[PDB]
Structures are given as structure tokens and as C-alpha cells.
Design a protein around this ligand. Structure first.
Ligand code: 1DM
Ligand code: 1DM
Ligand code: 1DM
Ligand code: 1DM
Ligand code: 1DM
Lengths: 103, 103, 103, 103, 103
């Protein structure tokens, strides 16, 4: 029922919006144990992760985590411009909660 | 079974057909807990969502919900023109029930 | 095993081969309860469905139904020429059993 | 720990390598009961199948069978050149064990 | 969590970074029993695998192994440039732990 990524992001603690307005510069993916994750970076210097699935995640988030990784990969590969990221700022690198792209 | 989206839409209460005839303007995807959803917009101003899986959904709809988000993402990335949406209007933003594409 | 769509199709009751030699004109996808289905049409005027999974299906068909819907979406999006369809003609619209594509 | 498809193929009985060096001419996909399979052909006149999953397959092969079908479809759609196929020659059509693509 | 592939790679024994700076020359995929795996090579003559799943992998890695193979396929097909590979060098061909791509 949120209508924008900013509305959605504001419903949670320890988050903020990063306005990226840019394609992904680098995409990294790991299948190493305990580090099953994706890392993206932008020309601005910003690094963000999709976190390893863990105890902080609720059950409904598990498929959503896998979806987000799918999305970032095809976004990287198509040079698609990301508009905004909603991130958790209590993790290093900051962790992706949501993404938006505009055309 | 129904032969068009409008026939299918009319089988349900709280629905209407939006004629879009346009590609998606923005795509938003969230893996935040209890907001595992997708939101799209069009240059018309209209906003639509695929709802978070919930009690209103029957089991057969779970896979369908995942497919619909899959569909909206690739439709956005390929700039594919949507023809119509069948939406439930008892939700804000309106909730996607079905989609048709042509051209 | 059969080597051709025509061979495969002949193994079944209530089927026939439609020769299409065309891309899909329209693609319709529904996540509406009891109508979790895809419908395609052609410039020829013909309309086909992938049926909702039900009691007429054996277990091994469940994953194959989902694949066929995936195939129809990507075939639509890339505007790929379908060669033939094997369909059950005891349904409305006729129900897709198999698909072939050639260049 | 094979380094090539030819080495991998040589580890099994009733296999052989077909050198294709060509895109797929036709792709056929079936969700008919007991024939949940894919068939591909080439201009050469050669025909190959991904078999219906069955008791000849071990558990680890189930996901791999689904992957191979995904690969054949995307390979067909993008007109990607197949280098070699490793196939079991104790089935008709010959059954795909492995694929390589070179470009 | 790590911010680059090199940082991630250095958390593990028997690894090293390969600088590839090149698209994949060949992609090989097997659904043969006990060789359910992917092998890629490059112009350079280098060869890498994603390993058959086994006891060396923890549960967490299962889904990530399937993703990595997904990533290698789409990367081959789009002719996408790989920057680095983190690889376990106690296997032949060396086994991919992580990938990075730039631009
Ligand atoms: O040894 C590893 N971790 C161990 C952690 N270990 C603790 C001691 O100091 C070194 C790190 C824990 N396991 C428990 C079971 O017995 C082995 C030790 C380990 C080895 C790993 O390499 C082995 O598995 C790989 C696939 O995951 C590759 O196949 C690699 O070739 C193989 O050596 C990988 C990973 N990992 O990804 O997390 C962990
Ligand atoms: O504690 C969380 N939620 C609530 C805790 N409680 C837990 C049980 O269910 C009811 C809610 C706290 N409330 C939520 C409403 O606003 C007031 C505070 C919470 C923390 C969250 O952040 C933590 O998990 C994240 C991944 O989901 C990140 O890893 C983040 O860094 C971590 O802090 C996230 C989510 N979520 O997405 O739903 C919820
Ligand atoms: O109430 C629904 N169905 C039928 C019976 N249903 C049975 C379950 O208990 C509620 C009532 C009623 N229809 C009336 C028209 O003639 C046919 C029978 C129903 C409501 C529905 O709307 C509700 O769920 C939607 C998602 O599935 C949306 O979230 C919508 O906003 C919500 O109202 C949807 C669906 N459906 O998808 O099949 C069915
Ligand atoms: O009756 C069937 N098989 C034999 C009886 N068991 O010389 C049968 C009927 C079939 O048709 C019925 O189910 C179909 C879906 O698989 C369609 O729904 C079709 O309309 C319906 O008649 C299909 C299949 N099948 O695919 O294996 C088998
Ligand atoms: O025996 C043994 C064996 C036989 C095998 O051949 C049989 O199964 C194949 C599919 O796994 C083919 O169906 C082949 O035709 C059949 O002989 C294959 C495999 N294997 O993949 O590990 C092992």
C-alpha cells in the first residue's frame, strides 16, 4: 500500500534513500560459504549489498532476497539506470531493502 | 475458460480494466519485511501494485504472484507496451489481477 | 520418444496440430484465483490457453505447465515465430499441449 | 573434474560427441503427460531430446534436467551456435547429456 | 561484510584472484549423473568450473551454486566482460567461489 519507494522506506527504522540515478558500475556475486551475497558499486563510490540470508530475515523475505539478486544482475547486464535505493544504514556495506528505476 | 482479459476480469468483484496502451514508467521492488511487493507507474499518473502474499490469496495464487512480478520486471526492462490491466480497486494502489500485452 | 511435434501430438486423444507460422499477437497473464492462466491470440484470430493446474493433470505436468507459461512470455516478448502448436480441442479456448518454433 | 565436454562425455557408456557448430533449427516443448520433454533439431537433419525425467535419473539430475531445457530454449531464441553435444545413443532420439557453446 | 571480491576471496583458504578482463570463450553444461556442472574457458586458455554440489558445500551454498551457473550462462550469451574470478585452486579446473564484472 505504499505508493513510492520513499513512502515504503520511511516505514522502517535504520533506513534512508540513496538517489543514484545511474547504472551499476560493478556487480559481484559470491557462492562462498557464509558469504552467499551480491555486491554492487557505482561510479560515485557507493557500495551496497544484498545480505546473506539470516536470522534477521523473516520467512516471506527469503524469496524476495533471491528476487532482488536476480534484479540487480539483469539490471547490471542491461546497463539499466537505477533511480533510488532504500537501504539499511546499520550494515556495512549498506544493505538493500528496495530499489526503483525510471524510464 | 475466459478468452480475453475483460471476460476474466468480470468474473470478479472489486475489479476494473485500465486500458494502459503504454510501457511502464517506473518499477519499484522491495524485499522489506511485510512489504515484499512490486509497484509500477505509468506516465498517465497511475500507480499499481502486486500485493504482498497474504490471507486473501489461495495456494494456487502463490506461484502466480511470483510470475506476475517476474513479468512486470522484464516488461519494464524491454520497454514492452502493456495493453490492459485487470485490477482490484479495493486496494491502494490498485492491485494487479491480470495483464495483457499487444504490439 | 517422438521426434517431432506432430508425432508427439498423435499420441493423445482430443488433440490437433495448428500450424501458426507467426509470432504471438497478444499475451494475457492472470494471477486471479482459480484463473491462474495464460491466454495467447494470433492475427489469424485463433485463441489458446495454458490451463489452470487441476485434477486432469498428473504431477509431472505441474512443472511443465509453469515452463510452458515461461516459454509463451519470452516467445511473445522477443516476437518469436511459432511454428506449430499441439492443442487439446476439448477445451475453450483450446489448451496448449506442446509448441514448436523454427527459423 | 573434466576440463572439456569431450572428456566429460568419455566418462560415460553409450555416449558420443556430435559436433554441431550451428544454431538450433527448431525447438519443441511438450507439457503433455508422460512426454514432458524438449526436442531440438538442426539443419543437418539431426534430432535430439532432453528425456522425460524418470527412474534412470538420480536426484541430483532433476534440477540439471530443468536447467538444460532452460539453456536449450534461450540458446534457440538467441540463435546461439552450439559447439558440441554429448548424447546417449541408446535412446531415440539421442538423449542430451551435455552441451557446449563456443563464440 | 566485504566490499570487494578480493576482500571476500581473502577470507578463505586455498583461493586466489584471477584477473580475466574478458568475455567467456566457451560455456559447457552437463546434466550427466555426478557431473551436474558448468565449465567455462577463455581466449587465454584458462578453464574454470562450478562444482557438482557435494558434502564440501553447506546448505546455504546450494541456491548460490544454482545462481552462479545461471550467471555464467547469461554472461556467456550476452558476451559480458568478466573482471575477476575468486577461485579455489585446490581443484582442477579451478572452482569458482565468486565473480565480478565491471562497466
Ligand atoms: O574448511 C572450510 N571451512 C571450515 C572453517 N575453517 C576453520 C578452520 O580454519 C580454516 C577455516 C569449516 N569446515 C567444517 C567441516 O570440515 C571442513 C572445515 C571451508 C572450505 C572450503 O573449501 C572447500 O569447499 C569449497 C566449496 O564450498 C570448494 O570445493 C573447495 O575446493 C573446498 O576445499 C570452503 C568453505 N566455504 O566456502 O565456506 C569453507
Ligand atoms: O525489528 C524490526 N521490526 C520490528 C520488530 N518486530 C519483530 C517481530 O515482528 C514485529 C516487529 C520493529 N518495529 C517495526 C515497526 O516499526 C517500529 C519498530 C525489523 C528490523 C529490520 O532490520 C533488520 O533486518 C534487516 C533485513 O530484514 C536488515 O538486516 C537490517 O540491517 C536489520 O536491522 C527489518 C525489518 N523488516 O524488514 O521487516 C524489521
Ligand atoms: O471473494 C472472492 N471470491 C468468491 C468467494 N470467496 C471465497 C473465499 O472467501 C471469500 C469469498 C466470491 N466470488 C464472487 C463472484 O462470483 C464468484 C465468487 C475473491 C475475492 C478476491 O479479492 C480479494 O483477494 C484479491 C487477491 O486474490 C485482492 O487482494 C482483493 O483486493 C481482495 O478483495 C479475489 C479472488 N480471487 O482472486 O479469486 C476471489
Ligand atoms: O485420458 C488420458 N490418458 C489415458 C487415461 N489415463 O491412449 C489423458 C487425457 C488428457 O487430456 C485431459 O487432460 C489434459 C491436460 O493434461 C487436458 O486438460 C485435456 O483437455 C483433458 O481432456 C491428457 C493426458 N495427458 O496429458 O497425459 C492423458
Ligand atoms: O549405469 C549408470 C548410468 C547410466 C546412465 O545412462 C542411463 O541414464 C541416462 C540419463 O541419466 C540416459 O537415459 C541413458 O540413455 C541411460 O542409459 C547414466 C548415468 N549417469 O548419468 O550417471 C549412469
Amino acid at each position: 500500500a505504499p505508493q513510492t519507494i520513499t513512502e515504503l522506506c520511511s516505514e522502517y527504522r535504520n533506513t534512508q534513500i540513496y538517489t543514484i540515478n545511474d547504472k551499476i558500475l560493478s556487480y559481484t556475486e559470491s557462492m562462498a560459504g557464509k558469504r552467499e551475497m551480491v555486491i554492487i558499486t557505482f561510479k560515485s563510490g557507493e557500495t551496497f549489498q544484498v545480505e546473506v540470508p539470516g536470522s534477521q530475515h523473516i520467512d516471506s523475505q527469503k524469496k524476495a532476497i533471491e528476487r532482488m539478486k536476480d534484479t540487480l544482475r539483469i539490471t547490471y547486464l542491461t546497463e539499466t539506470k537505477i533511480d533510488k535505493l532504500c537501504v539499511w544504514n546499520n550494515k556495512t556495506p549498506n544493505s538493500i531493502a528496495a530499489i526503483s528505476m525510471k524510464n
